[PDB]
Design a binder for this molecule. Structure first.
Ligand SMILES: CNc1ncnc2c(-c3ccccc3)[nH]nc12
Length: 148
């Protein structure tokens, strides 16, 4: 058995990226940036966590059919940074992450976990910075960690 993930202090968000380049840049430099409203959502979660648990980010390139990895948020959002570092010059700011897992996990492995906070839609049909209830996030993390 693996009873590791079955902890009550942690918050977990879906990250959608239009760009494979942004994923590569995030993995290379351990940084990320979302939309304005996505940044505010993540920043609020990171700050109210106050180091008492992780904020996990589950990354998926839009339309790709698979998740591509897992990162931990490692800083609050800096909203005034160099512009144009991502594929679109549509992102304002920067925060630190630490990539934990870089591996492709097909949506078929996860489509049966549904989100009660998002109309019971499959976790694989989430939008950018959709938050995942902790008890569903535990199931997703265990599937990602064991996939091969
Ligand atoms: C630099 N970070 C990013 N790069 C590429 N797409 C991003 C999104 C997104 C927003 C709406 C729909 C799908 C994706 N949010 N942050 C993104």
């Amino acid at each position: 058995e693996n009873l590791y993930f079955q902890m009550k202090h942690g918050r977990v968000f879906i990250i959608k990226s239009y760009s494979e380049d942004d994923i590569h840049r995030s993995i290379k430099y351990n940084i990320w940036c979302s939309t304005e409203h996505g940044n505010k959502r993540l920043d609020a979660a990171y700050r109210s966590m106050n180091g008492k648990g992780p904020v996990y980010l589950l990354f998926s390139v839009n339309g790709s059919g698979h998740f591509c990895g897992v990162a931990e948020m490692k800083s609050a959002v800096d909203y005034n940074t160099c512009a144009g570092v991502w594929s679109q010059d549509k992102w304002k700011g920067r925060f630190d992450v630490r990539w934990i897992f870089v591996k492709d996990v097909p949506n078929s492995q996860l489509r049966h976990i549904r989100l009660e906070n998002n109309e019971n839609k499959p976790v694989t049909n989430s939008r950018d910075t959709q938050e995942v209830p902790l008890e569903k996030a535990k199931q997703v993390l265990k599937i990602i960690a064991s996939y091969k």
